[PDB]
């Protein structure tokens, strides 16, 4: 039974994307705690296969993988026209490659979604779009002088999803490449839910954190390749490397538990009368940091998980050309709006960042600390 | 005979999609009469260069869906890509064309101009600016006066935009991504290109009148609906009391600029360029009195009892609607690679552009007025 009050139509579910770090969890939650049946499309479904015929015959009948890459595949509209609810999560999103990769980020974000919600509005079902935080960009009191009180002013840094801006960089900085697709899409599928009569939600999340987010490079991702935050300094602690912060690692940033984060969408599945329309923050504000600071909170949870002590100096800075190349800026402080999620579906997050570092760090050492021991030697 | 580097100008054959446009019309008029080359005119519509098909060649041609395109494109040696919706009108009333229009539609142009190796001159906006930093610090708050927050410089100054329900950034925001691709194809591979971002460009073939040159019920920019208001002798409506601000430039001082690119691919590839004129600068209520002062220098009669009025743009434009509140564009980077300069002021401008106006539309609308 649902929020309003009314009992839960069962459904198939349509997940684009299903193989990644969210969808995976999302699998989990759907299978585990709900009647869904789960189409799982993707090119790779390493990150589901404990949930699938391979590993066990424990969910068959309510998951179904499909290797497609949505780029070119006439399956897809019949795939879509078998669903009732169509989620997207298919987009390339690691901040590394939006200035060395533009071209395939803005495809990837907007060009290669566009089909899915042709489809989706031609065939009347619903769409979840994900998007990202990425889209306020920055805060508008970044602009305003050092150390000027209007800053501690909640109207220039809170996002609020119906009213708070989009500020971005300017065309030179690449690293909107991102942000602008996505930007893009959202204003397209609102426009599609206005123009013709769509019914849709967009999430917006905020620095998701958990298992299986992206990869530890030289193990299960290129040893080249340069994944977000958490993944990152996970790498520098299992390698007993210092953590590498960028520009001083000032910006700030709220981080949600994946699993805080997935109830979340859960509601927004099962209450499609208080999801359909809307935009909505998933995010948890109280788990504000600078980069800093969760370096230095990831090095004191790390020792407690691993046994060994920090480091001499356990963090050094490192410029952004050095680290991320030629058009990087930065988003400086994300603090998620909570009044329209909190409105719709009562979502809170319940999960600390301490706690939920602990909890991540203990899988990150579990999984990754024999094979980085043998990939020293 | 010669270009800023002091080199000769070789003739080009230019493909100029939207050439029978507000811009492309003028364009046309100055290739043809003030340089060596050939012109293909590529357009739905060619009203408003039909008075010069009497080295240039309409083609009737919808880049939607046209397969000739890629050919036109390789037969010329620069293309100059206009074809756009730009009326605010209808970025909040039909935000997928919007979109179609300025960002896919224009996707396969760039994909030959790469492939093929051509030059290509893409028509943005101002409008990627949005809104100033500025607007969002309190009213009458001092940090309001430092051009730190105002003025629009095309290599650092932000895309600010109004938030999603916001549908007039539609507009906006595809013109941004276009820009991003555009740029980023300049990177990821070699594409030489140029994008101009156009203030608010003021002139005689502009958009249209309502019940004349094109739908009574339509809206046009803001010169076409004061310039109908004027004709009728009703009051010039005032979109929530006209206190957002603009910088006009002349048509003519514009066309120049454009032409300076075109002939200096050595100082223009790669860049991003202002086109306005910051001299030139009103509220829109002033806009409306300067109209209704030189109108009536311009056309005998004088003015009415309230010449503007106040109206919501709930009423006006629609659901969605907001807007950039000061544009005033930077300069540095065209002033210093193409040496331009918007010679024409809003007063002598708007004395041409309505008296254009006057003698077009004035018999045509006592005719239709009866
Ligand atoms: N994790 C976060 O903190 C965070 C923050 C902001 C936004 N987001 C957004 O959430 C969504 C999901 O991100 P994620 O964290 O699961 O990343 P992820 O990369 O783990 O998930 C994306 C999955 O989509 C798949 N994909 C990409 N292109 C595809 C194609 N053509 N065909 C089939 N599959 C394709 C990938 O193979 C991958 O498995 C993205 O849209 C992202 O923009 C996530
Ligand atoms: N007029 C201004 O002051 C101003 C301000 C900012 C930006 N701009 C930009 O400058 C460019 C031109 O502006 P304009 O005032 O000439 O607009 P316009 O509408 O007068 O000219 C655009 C032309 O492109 C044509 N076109 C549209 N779709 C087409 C298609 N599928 N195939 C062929 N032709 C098509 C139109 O029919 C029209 O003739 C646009 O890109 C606009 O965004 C202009
Ligand atoms: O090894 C790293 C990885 C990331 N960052 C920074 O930490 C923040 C989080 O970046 P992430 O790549 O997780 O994504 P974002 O929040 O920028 O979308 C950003 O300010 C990055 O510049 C860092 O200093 N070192
Ligand atoms: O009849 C009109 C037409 C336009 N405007 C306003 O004048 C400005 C210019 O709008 P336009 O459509 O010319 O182009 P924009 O600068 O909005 O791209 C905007 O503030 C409009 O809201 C107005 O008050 N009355």
Same mark, same amino acid.
């Given at each position: 039974?649902?929020?309003? #009050?009314?009992?839960?139509?069962?459904?198939?579910?349509?997940? =684009?994307?299903?193989?990644?770090?969210?969808?995976?969890?999302?699998?989990?939650?759907?299978?585990?705690?709900?009647?869904?049946?789960?189409?799982?499309? &993707?090119?790779?479904?390493?990150?589901?296969?404990?949930?699938?015929?391979?590993?066990?015959?424990? $969910?068959?009948?309510?998951?179904?993988?499909?290797?497609?890459?949505?780029?070119?595949?006439?399956?897809?509209?019949?795939?879509?026209?078998?669903?009732?609810?169509? =989620?997207? !999560?298919?987009?390339?999103?690691?901040?590394?490659?939006?200035?060395?990769?533009?071209? &395939?980020?803005?495809?990837?974000?907007?060009? &290669?979604?566009?089909?899915?919600?042709?489809?989706?509005?031609?065939?009347?079902?619903?769409?979840?779009?994900?998007?990202?935080? +990425?889209?306020?960009?920055?805060?508008?009191?970044?602009?305003?002088?050092?150390?000027?009180?209007?800053?501690?002013?909640?109207? %220039?840094?809170?996002?609020?999803?119906?009213?708070?801006?989009?500020? %971005?960089?300017?065309?030179?900085?690449?690293? $909107?490449?991102?942000?602008?697709?996505?930007?893009?899409?959202?204003? !397209?599928?609102?426009?599609? @839910?206005?123009?013709?009569?769509?019914?849709?939600?967009?999430?917006?999340? %905020?620095?998701?954190?958990?298992?299986?987010?992206?990869?530890?490079?030289?193990?299960? #991702?290129?040893?080249? @390749?340069?994944?977000?935050?958490? /993944?990152?300094?996970?790498?520098?602690?299992?390698? *007993?490397?210092?953590?590498?912060?960028?520009?001083? #690692?000032?910006?700030?940033?709220?981080?949600?538990?994946?699993?805080?984060?997935?109830?979340?969408?859960?509601?927004?599945?099962?209450?499609?009368?208080?999801?359909? @329309?809307? =935009?909505?923050?998933?995010?948890?504000?109280?788990? +504000?940091?600078?980069?800093?600071?969760?370096?230095?909170?990831?090095?004191?949870?790390? /020792?407690?998980?691993? #046994? +060994?002590?920090?480091?001499?100096?356990?963090?050094?800075?490192?410029?952004?050309?050095?680290?991320?190349?030629?058009?990087? &800026?930065?988003?400086?402080?994300? =603090?998620?709006?909570?009044?329209?999620?909190?409105?719709?579906? @009562?979502?809170?997050?319940?999960?600390?960042? $301490?706690?939920?570092?602990?909890?991540?760090?203990?899988?990150?050492? *579990?999984?990754?600390?024999?094979?980085?021991?043998?990939?020293?030697?």
């Amino acid at each position: 039974v649902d929020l309003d #009050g009314k009992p839960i139509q069962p459904l198939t579910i349509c997940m =684009i994307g299903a193989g990644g770090f969210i969808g995976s969890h999302l699998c989990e939650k759907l299978l585990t705690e709900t009647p869904h049946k789960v189409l799982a499309l &993707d090119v790779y479904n390493d990150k589901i296969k404990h949930l699938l015929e391979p590993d066990t015959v424990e $969910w068959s009948g309510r998951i179904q993988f499909h290797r497609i890459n949505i780029k070119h595949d006439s399956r897809l509209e019949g795939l879509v026209k078998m669903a009732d609810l169509i =989620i997207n !999560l298919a987009a390339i999103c690691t901040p590394a490659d939006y200035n060395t990769r533009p071209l &395939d980020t803005i495809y990837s974000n907007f060009i &290669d979604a566009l089909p899915v919600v042709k489809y989706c509005s031609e065939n009347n079902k619903r769409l979840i779009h994900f998007s990202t935080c +990425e889209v306020y960009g920055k805060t508008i009191g970044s602009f305003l002088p050092k150390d000027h009180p209007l800053r501690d002013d909640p109207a %220039f840094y809170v996002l609020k999803e119906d009213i708070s801006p989009c500020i %971005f960089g300017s065309i030179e900085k690449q690293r $909107w490449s991102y942000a602008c697709a996505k930007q893009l899409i959202e204003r !397209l599928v609102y426009a599609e @839910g206005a123009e013709n009569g769509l019914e849709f939600t967009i999430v917006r999340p %905020f620095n998701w954190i958990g298992p299986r987010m992206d990869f530890i490079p030289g193990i299960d #991702g290129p040893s080249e @390749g340069v994944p977000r935050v958490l /993944a990152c300094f996970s790498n520098n602690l299992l390698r *007993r490397e210092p953590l590498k912060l960028v520009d001083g #690692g000032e910006s700030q940033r709220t981080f949600v538990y994946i699993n805080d984060a997935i109830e979340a969408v859960l509601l927004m599945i099962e209450n499609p009368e208080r999801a359909n @329309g809307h =935009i909505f923050n998933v995010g948890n504000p109280n788990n +504000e940091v600078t980069v800093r600071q969760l370096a230095e909170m990831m090095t004191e949870v790390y /020792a407690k998980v691993s #046994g +060994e002590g920090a480091i001499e100096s356990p963090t050094v800075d490192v410029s952004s050309k050095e680290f991320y190349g030629e058009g990087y &800026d930065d988003s400086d402080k994300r =603090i998620p709006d909570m009044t329209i999620i909190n409105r719709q579906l @009562g979502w809170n997050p319940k999960t600390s960042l $301490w706690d939920l570092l602990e909890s991540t760090l203990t899988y990150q050492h *579990r999984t990754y600390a024999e094979a980085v021991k043998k990939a020293t030697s």
